Nucleic acid binder design. Structure first.
Ligand SMILES: [Mg+2]
Ligand SMILES: [Mg+2]
Ligand SMILES: [Mg+2]
Ligand SMILES: [Mg+2]
Ligand SMILES: [Mg+2]
Ligand SMILES: [Mg+2]
Ligand SMILES: [Mg+2]
Ligand SMILES: [Mg+2]
Ligand SMILES: [Mg+2]
Ligand SMILES: [Mg+2]
Ligand SMILES: [Mg+2]
Ligand SMILES: [Mg+2]
Ligand SMILES: [Mg+2]
Ligand SMILES: [Mg+2]
Ligand SMILES: [Mg+2]
Ligand SMILES: [Mg+2]
Ligand SMILES: [Mg+2]
Ligand SMILES: [Mg+2]
Ligand SMILES: [Mg+2]
Ligand SMILES: [Mg+2]
Ligand SMILES: [Mg+2]
Ligand SMILES: [Mg+2]
Ligand SMILES: [Mg+2]
Ligand SMILES: [Mg+2]
Ligand SMILES: [Mg+2]
Ligand SMILES: [Mg+2]
Ligand SMILES: [Mg+2]
Ligand SMILES: [Mg+2]
Ligand SMILES: [Mg+2]
Ligand SMILES: [Mg+2]
Ligand SMILES: [Mg+2]
Ligand SMILES: [Mg+2]
Ligand SMILES: [Mg+2]
Ligand SMILES: [Mg+2]
Ligand SMILES: [Mg+2]
Ligand SMILES: [Mg+2]
Ligand SMILES: [Mg+2]
Ligand SMILES: [Mg+2]
Ligand SMILES: [Mg+2]
Ligand SMILES: [Mg+2]
Ligand SMILES: [Mg+2]
Ligand SMILES: [Mg+2]
Ligand SMILES: [Mg+2]
Ligand SMILES: [Mg+2]
Ligand SMILES: [Mg+2]
Ligand SMILES: [Mg+2]
Ligand SMILES: [Mg+2]
Ligand SMILES: [Mg+2]
Ligand SMILES: [Mg+2]
Ligand SMILES: [Zn+2]
Lengths: 122, 58, 127, 52, 135, 103, 50, 84
RNA sequence: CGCGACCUCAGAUCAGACGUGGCGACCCGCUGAAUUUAAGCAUAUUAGUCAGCGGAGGAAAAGAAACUAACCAGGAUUCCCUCAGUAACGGCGAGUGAACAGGGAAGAGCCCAGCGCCGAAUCCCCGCCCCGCGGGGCGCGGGACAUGUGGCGUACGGAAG
RNA sequence: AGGCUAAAUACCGGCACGAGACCGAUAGUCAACAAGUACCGUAAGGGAAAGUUGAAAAGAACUUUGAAGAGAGAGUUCAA
RNA sequence: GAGCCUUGAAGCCUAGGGCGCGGGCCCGGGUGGAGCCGCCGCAGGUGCAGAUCUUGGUGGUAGUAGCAAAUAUUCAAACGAGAACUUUGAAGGCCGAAGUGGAGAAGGGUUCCAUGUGAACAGCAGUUGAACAUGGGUCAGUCGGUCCUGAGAGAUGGGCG
RNA sequence: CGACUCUUAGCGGUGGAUCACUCGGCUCGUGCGUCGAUGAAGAACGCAGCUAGCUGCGAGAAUUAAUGUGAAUUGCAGGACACAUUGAUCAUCGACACUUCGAACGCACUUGCGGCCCCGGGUUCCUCCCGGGGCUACGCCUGUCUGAGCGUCGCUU
């Protein structure tokens, strides 16, 4: 038996939670098998069990994050983990509109007196 | 049992009652010098520690 | 002569990248030539070797007419191991002799759909 | 790092050395004493066509 | 003027520097007021400042501060120069009017000590032992 | 410390000059940078000529260089008014304009 | 000292985790030259000092 | 009675492991650190000790956020994820 | 006595947003010695540096003259070669030490307070509709700032009716 | 006595990068290696030593003396 | 230099042969296993007998001094290949309650306990240990911290800088 | 005659000098400009089946998801061996997660002591009752709420 991410991303959370609980029950039973001696064919199994627990938790958190973004998208004052992350200087960028926003005198000056294209040989 | 250090007597008692379906009389905790917590969980007299140990596999 | 200034001629840098290259680079490093009839039939110079390739060894202590199937590819040691090529220890236990895959002539490849796509890209790029 | 590495030469001496090297390239004894194999080679400095 | 912070007026040097009582502090008190205002409120931007009072001891200034994140200042692009991060803490780098007047720059024959940028840049360009490949 | 008949020398090396040694090891580097800057300007900017704006005939202020001639800065607004064109219209045509130059 | 705060027992617990020799299989690995633990602290010669 | 009889009285440690740089320098009797200056808001650095900068400046620990800042700057801080 | 308006203020875990700290090779602001030299040592040199403190950016600073010059005049700042180890400072001792030209890289210029004219024609915020992808920006209705002065027209090269 | 502005300029920190009339484990960075590590001082701080088997461990099966360390035979390797 | 070579380069040794006045060099013989030299020009971090020279190693001393502060050990047996020292029986002594006894604070950090080994450690020795390897061991409403202030240290208001 | 002492040579013994090699430094030049209140640099603790250090990570802990390549990692048993299902390792990383201290932020910090709001079981509800989740640092900007004056004024008793 295997645990695939494409298999996990299609199921509902009420089945993912029960499958995660089953994985943690197997986690605890193979921890008991790790503490006791004669269970040597179970240690790669507890390795792939804890990797599967990580996979199921990752799929659940991906589903919760996209489900949050589906209704925080397009809303004013979206939360801090959903705001862009990039770096602090890129947060203190003004805007593309605030960068392109020009005063009326300079706009009318560029309207009246534009830059020309030419060549001077003859 | 061996417990993470961020837990207390009440969390150990609730964890044992909600996992092993058994009642707990008391919990005595010490810090094992390797870095973990050693918890002595004494059960109710209605339950049998040998039967619980055989069901959990130790 | 090297003309692109973004690639090294430095001996230390080349040996560093060679002996610390990751496994997907080491697969390209451990490439092996092909026999003359197989390169005539496929129009390709050389292929990376895998687990189920048949091997004739051309140089070393074992040379020629010893077509055998490889079993292990240590990319950490840059060594393939061949089932036919044996050497006894002191205690009568056999062990495979270390053979570098550049001194290896492949006589039979492994057929796979991925290797058909690789061979088609090789033939299309060789043109 | 501030050793006096690069040494300026007079351009007249540069052109003098170029003219001296090109003049010494014409004598067969000098180039045979440098060691180029000019046994079966035809006439000194070789001039090939514009199709080359 | 300022008093030298050495203990008991002892300098421990040549007789050039025993004048503990008189160090007269090349920055102006208007620049000191700009420093104190902007450093107490680093979120603001010190534009300028002006004198409003004196009696004997306390000199009184009023300092104008610009808020680089209010929308009326982030718009109106005759003001967006101070929102840029190269104008953070003008009062402690010496970029205001009192700051420039304390630095002592300007065009003229009276300002060859700081010939360009700053007096340390002028010192750098005048004591750079410049060397070339070909000499 | 001094010696036989030689010139009195006062070198200015008492200051710690070893920290501030600017040696032109990047002189061909700056040459290649500035070649690429001029070529990238002539490619990307315009079919305008290199050294775009036109400079005036200007006499050098001296009793030494005033017999010679110099390319100045701008065309001295009275001159530009006699030529009969607007200021920024001249600047976009390619005329270099300096409002300080008198006549 | 027989009674002390929790950070000191965390430090002593990590030092007890440190105090163990090299196992027999790491020296058997490929390209290894570690033969014995040079960071081996003995409780008489070297004192950690809190 | 100046040396070896006076070394035996050394019993009460003045410095204890601080909690910002962890180098056994938090002077308990003064409630301050001897290396970083813990009740001060800023790290205690100087220019007379270049080796202290060599020990304490960046590039000697994880840089668990600063390395992935480099890793995101190598492409330009993308927000889209992947194609199919 | 009470109610209301304005002005000075306090409170909050009020809504939204901002500064702290680190690196600091380059850059900016302050102040800041002595070893060394002067064969001694005080002025001087070391040095307006070393150390100390405060700040930001990939550059920083400076930058459109209260300029240079004094003749057939030039014309923002920066960088290089010259000027020049020169004018000059200095127990005129040791030593320190520019600038204007001139030739090159670079070239880009501008805005505001005042003066009057426009019935504040101006900006911030709140709520719903018009909107497209990966997302936030114009238009509708009322809450504030602002007449102790928003914005347009204006900049010493003149400007306005 | 109010303000902005890119270019030429600087960079021994950082991310990759290419070259060398340079050095060769007492040299070159303190550090080619589990190096600011071991260790020292209460602390500020100080601060090392340390590369190489073989082509592949094929690292010596087995006999024998001694309890073993070790040794004599035998064997692998072009070479013990 | 169509230089030298895995049919053996550099390096090292040599009661071998020789040259030059000398700096040094060439050849032979023995280990070694992968690079080296001659001429002409060029550039050096370019030659060691010293510096109470720096680093590293090794002799005479030298199997020498020294294993001497605190009254003392002796017999038999046992595990063991091995006993002046390990364990037990017995005898004789010491510490003699202000202890060579039973437990604590600071400090140490696993040294506490069991099992196994005895190259390494203990200044001889071990079958022994605080050495080494493996596995265990610290359980609190009522013991203490946590609460309180003492001498004192301290932030805000305020002031200075 | 032997013993002791001296000089060579052969062989043997701590010693690692010379020679040869370099995943290392040093110097120079070019390209880009990049931390943090959406928790920086640094530190503590923990994580592998056998795992002390370095390296890599943060209770999803020797890496998760996705893309690309395409049959391995490896010292040892095991595990997925499947590829006319989805696929091991490796690199990229653009999506999730990132314990505690730390500008460190409820207080000083002894992992102690709190205070609000919500949810689950404990006498089905506060009354100093267990677990879980969110908030609770300073200064300051714009706007909202409340009130202070014998600061100035209007209307009225
Ligand atoms: Mg190199
Ligand atoms: Mg010269
Ligand atoms: Mg003389
Ligand atoms: Mg000096
Ligand atoms: Mg210590
Ligand atoms: Mg006495
Ligand atoms: Mg605090
Ligand atoms: Mg003297
Ligand atoms: Mg003197
Ligand atoms: Mg001076
Ligand atoms: Mg300094
Ligand atoms: Mg700062
Ligand atoms: Mg930056
Ligand atoms: Mg400026
Ligand atoms: Mg003189
Ligand atoms: Mg001077
Ligand atoms: Mg003007
Ligand atoms: Mg001005
Ligand atoms: Mg200005
Ligand atoms: Mg610039
Ligand atoms: Mg060597
Ligand atoms: Mg060393
Ligand atoms: Mg090898
Ligand atoms: Mg041989
Ligand atoms: Mg010679
Ligand atoms: Mg020398
Ligand atoms: Mg050299
Ligand atoms: Mg010598
Ligand atoms: Mg001598
Ligand atoms: Mg000596
Ligand atoms: Mg000796
Ligand atoms: Mg004796
Ligand atoms: Mg004697
Ligand atoms: Mg004694
Ligand atoms: Mg017996
Ligand atoms: Mg016996
Ligand atoms: Mg008695
Ligand atoms: Mg008593
Ligand atoms: Mg006693
Ligand atoms: Mg014991
Ligand atoms: Mg035993
Ligand atoms: Mg002994
Ligand atoms: Mg031990
Ligand atoms: Mg009880
Ligand atoms: Mg105080
Ligand atoms: Mg205050
Ligand atoms: Mg050595
Ligand atoms: Mg995956
Ligand atoms: Mg909560
Ligand atoms: Zn600290």
């Amino acid at each position: 038996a295997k645990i695939k991410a494409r298999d996990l991303r299609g199921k509902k959370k009420e089945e993912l939670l029960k499958q995660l609980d089953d994985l943690k029950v197997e986690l605890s039973q193979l921890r008991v098998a790790k503490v006791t001696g004669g269970a040597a064919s179970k240690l790669s199994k507890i390795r792939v069990v804890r990797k599967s627990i990580a996979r199921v938790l990752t799929v659940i958190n991906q589903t919760q994050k996209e489900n949050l973004r589906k209704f925080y998208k397009g809303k004013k004052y979206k939360p801090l983990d959903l705001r862009p992350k990039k770096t602090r200087a890129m947060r203190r960028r003004l805007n593309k509109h605030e960068e392109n926003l020009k005063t009326k005198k300079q706009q009318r000056k560029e309207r009246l007196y534009p830059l020309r294209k030419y060549a001077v040989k003859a | 049992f061996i417990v993470d250090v961020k837990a207390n007597k009440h969390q150990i008692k609730q964890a044992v009652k909600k996992l092993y379906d058994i009642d707990v009389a008391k919990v005595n905790t010490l810090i094992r010098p390797d870095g973990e917590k050693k918890a002595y969980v004494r059960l109710a007299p209605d339950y049998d520690a040998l039967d619980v140990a055989n069901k959990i596999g130790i | 002569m090297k003309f692109n200034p973004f690639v090294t001629s430095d001996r230390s840098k080349n040996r560093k990248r060679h002996f610390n290259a990751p496994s997907h680079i080491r697969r390209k490093i451990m490439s092996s030539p092909l026999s003359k009839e197989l390169r005539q039939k496929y129009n390709v110079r050389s292929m990376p070797i895998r687990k189920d390739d048949e091997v004739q060894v051309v140089r070393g202590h074992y040379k020629g007419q010893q077509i055998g199937k490889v079993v292990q590819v240590y990319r950490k040691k840059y060594v393939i191991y061949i089932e036919r090529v044996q050497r006894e220890k002191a205690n009568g236990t056999t062990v495979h002799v270390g053979i570098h895959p550049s001194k290896v002539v492949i006589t039979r490849l492994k057929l796979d759909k991925d290797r058909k796509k690789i061979l088609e890209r090789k033939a299309k790029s060789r043109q | 790092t501030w050793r006096r590495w690069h040494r300026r030469v007079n351009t007249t001496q540069k052109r003098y050395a170029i003219c001296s090297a090109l003049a010494a390239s014409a004598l067969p004894a000098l180039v045979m004493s440098k060691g180029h194999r000019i046994e079966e080679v035809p006439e000194l400095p070789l001039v090939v066509e514009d199709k080359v | 003027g300022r008093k030298r912070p050495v203990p008991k007026g002892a300098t421990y040097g040549k007789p050039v520097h025993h004048g503990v009582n008189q160090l007269k502090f090349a920055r102006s008190l208007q620049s000191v007021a700009e420093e104190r205002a902007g450093r107490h409120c680093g979120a603001l931007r010190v534009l300028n400042s002006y004198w409003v009072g004196e009696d004997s001891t306390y000199k009184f200034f009023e300092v104008i501060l610009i808020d680089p994140f209010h929308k009326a200042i982030r718009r109106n692009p005759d003001t967006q120069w101070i929102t840029k991060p190269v104008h953070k803490h003008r009062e402690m780098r010496g970029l205001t009017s009192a700051g420039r007047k304390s630095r002592g720059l300007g065009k003229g024959h009276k300002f060859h000590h700081t010939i360009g940028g700053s007096r340390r840049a002028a010192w750098r360009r005048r004591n750079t032992l410049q060397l070339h490949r070909y000499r | 410390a001094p010696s036989r008949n030689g010139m009195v020398l006062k070198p200015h090396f008492h200051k710690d000059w070893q920290r501030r040694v600017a040696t032109w090891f990047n002189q061909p580097a700056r040459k290649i940078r500035r070649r690429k800057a001029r070529q990238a300007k002539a490619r990307r900017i315009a079919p305008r000529p290199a050294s775009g704006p036109i400079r005036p005939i200007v006499r050098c202020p001296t009793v030494r260089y005033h017999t010679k001639v110099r390319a100045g800065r701008g065309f001295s607004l009275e001159e530009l008014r006699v030529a009969g064109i607007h200021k920024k219209v001249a600047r976009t045509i390619g005329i270099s304009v300096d409002p300080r130059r008198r006549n | 000292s027989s009674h002390k705060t929790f950070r000191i027992k965390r430090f002593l617990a990590k030092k007890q985790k440190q105090n163990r020799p090299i196992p027999q299989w790491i020296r058997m690995k490929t390209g290894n030259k570690i033969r014995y633990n040079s960071k081996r602290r003995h409780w008489r010669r070297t004192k950690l000092g809190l | 009675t100046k040396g070896t009889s006076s070394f035996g009285k050394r019993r009460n440690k003045t410095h204890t492991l601080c909690r910002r740089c962890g180098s056994k320098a938090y002077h308990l009797q003064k409630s301050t650190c001897g290396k970083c200056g813990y009740p001060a808001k800023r790290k205690r650095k100087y220019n007379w000790s270049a080796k202290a900068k060599r020990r304490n400046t960046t590039g000697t620990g994880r840089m668990r956020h600063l390395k992935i800042v480099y890793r995101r700057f190598r492409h330009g801080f993308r927000e889209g994820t992947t194609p199919k």
